């Protein structure tokens, strides 16, 4: 169920794998 959620953050936590 919380794997769901991430995806919540995913929408932004992405941002991190931007960099590089």
């Known amino acids: 169920g919380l794997f769901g959620a991430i ?9 991190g794998m931007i960099d590089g």
């Open 7 to 15: 995806a919540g953050a995913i929408e932004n936590g992405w941002e």
